[PDB]
């Protein structure tokens, strides 16, 4: 699901240098076990910026014809420091051209932010509150459009839309609507922050978010978490967890999993599979650091093939191996992480079924998944839910929730089956 294009970029070193920072090398790896040299920052008014072709996150293949393959960080630095003022770079761009193709909530084509804000104010001030209008609008606009609605609402009423909705709404409907009004990174960061209660930490919610978010999402959550709460997320994980569960949660929350390379490393797939077996089912006890490193460092496609090759060696697959090897929060985090790796849409489909199958509703889990995945992979979640449970996700939301709260959730579902 990416696009790679190689390009030669020729720059002139001006009075303030080439104008970008490089990360990487065999001893300062950009992501896990990746020795490539990458562009981290690009300085305004610099040579690279004024040129425009080089982008943040580019991989630098060579400098003046000299390859930056398997170099120490200093040797890569030295090639730049000792190049002339005319520097020729071969660069590899990595692209993401997907967006919300599998989300259920699409951008409204006839969007009018000022009009939406007016209609929402009117629905708010109406005697008794017009919840239906509020739900109809916000659950049928994309997250970014909701931001523009919120901005215009403040501009018109000189009051924040979220504050007005805290007073006009209640119950589970308020929880959904307030969740939709946050950006994805803000929603996840606030859900993570709300889970940390010292010894009473909501580990299930930590596991859900940290095990299912990608590198890009996690790096944005990390950035937004520090802005909102003036403390790094990793520090909050450290002071709210312990033991191997903390190490796993810290490692995943760094968001530095290896990106899927073009070549498939079949030798490393087999070796990782053997290591997971040797560290667990094959021995007395468990080498947990070995599981943590492998399951957090390797790319998701690579690990998908590792777990299948694992069944060639182990009488038990990875999931039932975990249930036989570890307990408690550690076992639950491993089970969630492996499901996310093997089939993330199915992972959320099973969680949604879990939140509704029994008595009552785990509304916190149901709402968080319906909100956070509505613009990511909700169509895939619905497909996996339908295939496994025979009836639709729409149907289960219908039987388990009522009123305008049900209406908003069904809108985020997007349709039947």
């Amino acid at each position: 699901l990416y696009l790679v294009t190689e390009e030669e970029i020729n720059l002139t070193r001006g009075p303030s240098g080439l104008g970008f920072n490089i990360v990487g090398g065999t001893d300062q790896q950009y992501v896990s076990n990746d020795s490539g040299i990458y562009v981290s920052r690009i300085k305004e008014n610099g040579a690279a910026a004024l040129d425009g072709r080089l982008q943040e996150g580019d991989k630098i293949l060579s400098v003046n014809g000299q390859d930056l393959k398997n170099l120490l960080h200093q040797d890569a630095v030295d090639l730049f420091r000792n190049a002339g003022y005319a520097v020729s770079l071969r660069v590899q761009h990595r692209l993401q051209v997907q967006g919300s193709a599998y989300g259920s909530v699409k951008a409204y084509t006839n969007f009018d932010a000022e009009r939406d804000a007016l209609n929402i104010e009117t629905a708010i001030k109406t005697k008794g509150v017009d919840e239906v209008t509020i739900v109809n609008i916000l659950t049928n606009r994309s997250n970014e459009q909701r931001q523009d609605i919120a901005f215009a609402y403040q501009r018109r009423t000189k009051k924040e839309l979220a504050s007005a909705l805290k007073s006009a709404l209640s119950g589970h409907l308020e929880t959904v609507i307030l969740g939709l009004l946050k950006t994805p990174a803000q929603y996840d960061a606030s859900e993570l922050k709300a889970s940390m209660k010292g010894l009473g930490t909501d580990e299930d919610s930590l596991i859900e978010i940290i095990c299912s978010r990608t590198n890009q999402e996690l790096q944005e959550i990390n950035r937004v978490y520090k802005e909102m709460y003036k403390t790094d997320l990793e520090k909050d994980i450290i002071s709210d967890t312990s033991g191997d569960f903390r190490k796993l949660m810290v490692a995943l929350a760094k968001g530095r999993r290896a990106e899927d390379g073009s070549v498939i490393d079949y030798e490393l797939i087999d070796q990782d599979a053997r290591d997971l077996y040797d560290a667990g089912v094959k021995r007395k006890g468990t080498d947990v650091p070995k599981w943590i490193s492998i399951m957090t460092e390797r790319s998701v496609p690579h690990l998908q093939k590792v777990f299948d090759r694992y069944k060639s060696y182990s009488p038990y697959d990875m999931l039932e191996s975990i249930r036989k090897e570890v307990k408690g929060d550690l076992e639950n985090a491993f089970l969630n992480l492996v499901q996310c790796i093997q089939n993330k849409p199915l992972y959320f489909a099973d969680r949604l079924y879990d939140s509704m199958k029994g008595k009552g509703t785990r509304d916190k889990v149901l709402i968080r998944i319906m909100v956070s995945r509505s613009e990511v992979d909700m169509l895939k979640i619905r497909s996996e839910f339908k295939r496994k449970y025979g009836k639709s996700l729409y149907y289960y939301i219908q039987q388990d929730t009522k009123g305008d709260y049900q209406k908003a959730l069904l809108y985020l579902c997007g349709g039947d089956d």
């Binding site: 240098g17 080439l18 970008f20 920072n21 490089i22 990360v23 990487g24 981290s40 920052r41 960080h73 630095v77 730049f80 420091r81």
Partner: peptide, 6 residues
């Protein structure tokens, strides 16, 4: 964190 300015 941080890389190297070039």
């Amino acid at each position: 964190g941080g890389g190297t300015s070039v």
